[PDB]
Design a protein around this ligand. Structure first.
Ligand SMILES: Cc1ncc(C[n+]2c([C@@H](O)CCC(=O)O)sc(CCOP(=O)(O)OP(=O)(O)O)c2C)c(N)n1
Ligand SMILES: Cc1ncc(C[n+]2c([C@@H](O)CCC(=O)O)sc(CCOP(=O)(O)OP(=O)(O)O)c2C)c(N)n1
Ligand SMILES: [Mg+2]
Ligand SMILES: [Mg+2]
Ligand SMILES: [Mn+2]
Ligand SMILES: [Mn+2]
Lengths: 556, 556
């Protein structure tokens, strides 16, 4: 009748159950109340274990691992504010689909709402953000193991996307030698312990039916909009749009190759929007569109029908057009709605896109963040991946660069938080093992500064560029009021990152010109470690350059 | 009919209303959706405005300001994960009573659940943790200003303790020159704009009644337990217990002067617990007791009645004794239930407490964290305050030191998170303007590392001691399993803090002996800046010294 042993055998069912649903990575933060979960995880040979001391960063590490691997990733934390720190990553996963399985240790019911240390009300604390929430009962052998595994199996098997909150109360004692308490209870599952399948297989698939009138609609003047999708999907969408003869507006997140690049610039030209007024249908694949001019064009356009195809659920059109919301894997959907070669209908836009890119090329020389974004293709690691941060960088790359088709791009553009970008990048790198280029702003790097600890362990080179324009210079692009702008928006912190790199024994470069930047890259890709490259630029030059290029292209 | 102007007029009502409830400090993080709130705050001369880029730290800065000032403190953040980052501080405030008023900007209803950038489901996202939750409607002149102010006045006036979540949707446009849109709507409040009172005054007091049998109980064999309370309350409790002749078990957080010090040691002696079996009543004032031996004694004791007096609501006895839960300001309660001069009844415990302190003193010389804790009373800044971190430091000071009566001690011991200690210390300092000694462990300093940015602005010297024992050595004190201990519990990060200090232009010392520590203190107290003092100690010496002293005293 050992409580500590039974706690561990209850936890062992939970952890073993997760292995039957593809969970391999598990991210663990330290604690005492989490002991049953952590020891079950440590003893289970199925897992790759990652650790970190900041639970907010731990959640984002898990997000990054899940984002790239397309597997559910588990997280273990102890009770209290440790749990609350998982909320940012959980929210992001709810928007972009990562399957995060949050195993949150709790005090038992007799220690809630009585002033006990590190005891808070945990069931329901993430409100509607998890896809599923399981509030487990106080462990007892009077609840059979088959109930516990079935409950796990239901949550994981029916999970289309997003997080699962599994709250796990345990009473003390937590420590002690294992004895045989609970062994016969576990053995009621019989040879499930040697199986590779769930105890309960419940795996309904959610998918829209094929659209039977596609072969009518594909004959019309259409536009393809490509948002966030996989690298392979981007290549397939590019070929499909080309065959249809429809213009493709491709986001930085699409990996389509952006055949009509600089859309954030050319969509500001009235000749382009006039031509797009002829579109009778818009088929958008993927979502979370980046650029302002694209979002404004989406909001203004009035095709007879607007379709959004994505593997995310729910409405995805913030302008609420008449049309269709089609839940599907994009590659599968394209096979069911194929293209037939048809003469292209756009005449003006291809010329404008070429002129827009030429205007950007003309400005490539200055050593600034707009130019870095424009030139970033030249710096992508071979057989690698790009992790793009939030704020100006994603907008500048989207507006000013043409990224190669099929070259993987990752981001946190559901809620677009600046709170977890370094820890997410670490997980993105570890999941695929690829060389990684990550680009973030200065406030973003400060926000997740302690994730430099995680970047001490990468399996291939990771270059972290920190663009230091001394504050959040998106607020110099937006029409914020001048008098309050510095103190209440930009918030310059007047730091550099050399000492941050040194604290974590990371290589550091602060290049002053393009030649020094290319030398720093050549150095960085040589070893499976993280290099920090700080690009110090004048505060508002990037915002102003984008504004100037917008105006120039609007007048062509 | 300017939306941007009306947004600002709506926000100005909210912000002005708060000034009538004692809100002086407002903590602001950057964003666009928060513009109406941030500009209304910036324009309101009633406020002291603080900024920070990490919303988790921002919440803790506000927690520290409220903890010291005993007034509500407001927070403004933008929509999205920025809001989620306030959860830790909100949870802590719910447990310990700080009044945090969270003004969380939101997208308007038409932009929720449609794939819009940086838009999440915010109403109710903090579940039951706020004391009050207001989900404001989409701004409109068709709802009168008297409703809006009345709603806020109800929430603030009836707030006994804890946080208030005020969710604030605003539609674009957000930017633009003010025009007179909404001026007549504001003017319906008439001369309230020139008043110093709420529009609606709703402020019932919550307080237990006089205990009519106190004159009976005060003549019994009682014990006084002093938990967290104000510095002035600690002095009053000490005198009251001494007058009654009842032994006083005083927590590190009590500021009673700890007349029977080293209780965590002497309560491990069976002679002390046998003497305490004679107690017929226990009167505990304050809560969140620190030490293990005290919590164990509380759990085992069976007085006829157990009373807890505190200005926090709800049950506060994790052992669920028969007795009374009395809600009151402690100083008022002592005046209502005065002591009578009676002969002390304990004889053995005073002997054991003196012998326990002698045993600690004999071990004072080694340059380790147990010794620093023991001697910390000798290093307290004159007319200053102590901020004590979580994990070992609070336990070691509580077990090994005798802190002076009335010397202010602050802490985050509701949920005892290691996630916000540096930002909280910054707010503690700024609120009182006093010289501050803050002591935290290495993982704690890493967790809130970027709050060193805030510690660049203190109004009096702040000494931050970082005890670097290379991991979470509480897990070497706890009986964690040796095989998994390092990787899955201690999580050494193998860093030092010299570069962190340099990044933020803070003076730094790594003293190697007591003389060097004393020299560092002497220099640090001379300027109104933060000095980082890193005390590098051998990993397990502190835990082992505590274990040895527990054993030694248990055998006396
Ligand atoms: C956790 C949280 N809290 C606050 C914000 C608000 N917020 C932004 C959203 O406005 C924009 C999101 C986006 O769509 O990209 S961008 C931004 C400043 C970033 O500064 P930087 O890294 O120096 O980069 P730069 O601006 O290019 O110089 C902030 C503070 C947030 N996003 N997440
Ligand atoms: C946000 C969050 N997440 C995780 C934890 C779990 N947790 C603790 C609770 O066990 C103890 C709370 C207490 O009662 O004091 S203590 C601790 C290690 C601290 O390491 P350190 O700073 O180097 O100090 P040292 O151990 O003295 O060397 C952790 C990681 C937490 N508290 N808060
Ligand atoms: Mg996908
Ligand atoms: Mg009080
Ligand atoms: Mn910046
Ligand atoms: Mn430590």
């Amino acid at each position: 009748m050992s409580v500590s042993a039974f706690n561990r055998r209850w936890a062992a069912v939970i952890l073993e159950a997760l292995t039957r649903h593809g969970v391999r990575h598990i991210c663990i933060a330290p604690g005492s109340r989490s002991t049953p979960l952590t020891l079950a995880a440590a003893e289970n040979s199925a897992f790759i274990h990652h650790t970190h001391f900041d639970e907010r960063g731990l959640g984002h590490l898990a997000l990054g691992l899940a984002k790239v691997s397309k597997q559910p990733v588990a997280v273990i934390v102890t009770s209290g504010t440790a749990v609350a720190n998982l909320y940012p990553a959980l929210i992001e996963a709810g928007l972009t689909g990562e399957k995060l399985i949050l195993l949150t240790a709790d005090r038992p019911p007799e220690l809630i709402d009585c002033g006990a240390n590190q005891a808070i009300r945990q069931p329901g604390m993430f409100a509607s953000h998890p896809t599923h929430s399981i509030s487990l009962p106080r462990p007892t052998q009077d609840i059979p193991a088959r109930w516990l595994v079935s409950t796990i199996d239901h949550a994981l098997g029916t999970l289309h996307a997003g997080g699962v909150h599994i709250n796990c109360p345990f009473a003390e004692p937590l420590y002690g030698e294992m004895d045989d308490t609970g062994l016969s209870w576990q053995q009621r599952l019989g040879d499930w312990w040697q199986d590779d399948k769930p105890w309960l297989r419940e795996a309904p698939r959610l998918e829209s039916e094929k659209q039977r009138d596609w072969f009518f609609w594909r004959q019309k003047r259409g536009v393809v909009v490509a948002g966030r999708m996989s690298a392979e999907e981007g290549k397939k969408v590019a070929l499909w749009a080309q065959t249809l003869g429809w213009p493709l507006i491709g986001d930085v997140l699409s990996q389509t190759g952006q055949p009509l690049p600089c859309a954030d610039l050319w969509l500001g030209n009235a000749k382009a929007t006039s031509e797009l007024q002829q579109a009778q249908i818009v088929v958008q694949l993927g979502s979370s569109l980046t650029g302002k001019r694209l979002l404004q064009w989406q909001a203004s356009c009035e095709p007879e029908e607007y379709w959004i195809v994505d593997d995310i659920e729910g409405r995805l059109d913030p302008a609420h057009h008449r049309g269709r919301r089609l839940i599907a894997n994009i590659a599968d959907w394209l096979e069911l709605h194929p293209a037939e070669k048809r003469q292209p209908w756009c005449v003006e836009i291809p010329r404008l896109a070429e002129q827009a890119m030429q205007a950007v090329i003309a400005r490539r020389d200055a050593f600034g963040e707009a130019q870095l974004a424009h030139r970033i293709c030249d710096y992508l690691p071979e057989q690698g991946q790009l992790f793009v941060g939030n704020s100006l960088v994603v907008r500048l790359i989207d507006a000013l660069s043409q990224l190669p088709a099929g070259y993987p791009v990752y981001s946190n553009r559901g809620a677009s938080g600046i709170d977890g970008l370094l820890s997410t990048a670490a997980g993105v790198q570890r999941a695929s093992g690829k060389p990684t280029l990550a680009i973030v702003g200065d406030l973003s790097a400060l926000y997740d500064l302690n994730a430099l600890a995680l970047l001490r362990q990468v399996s291939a080179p990771l270059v972290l560029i920190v663009v230091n324009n001394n504050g959040g210079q998106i607020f110099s692009l937006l029409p914020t009021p001048q008098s309050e702008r510095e103190r209440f928006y930009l918030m310059p912190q007047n730091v550099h990152f050399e000492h941050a790199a040194a604290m974590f024994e990371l290589k550091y470069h602060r290049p002053q010109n393009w030649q020094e930047l290319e030398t720093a890259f050549a150095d960085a890709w040589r070893t499976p470690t993280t290099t920090v490259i700080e690009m110090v630029v004048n505060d508002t030059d990037g915002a102003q350059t984008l504004q100037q290029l917008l105006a120039q292209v609007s007048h062509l």
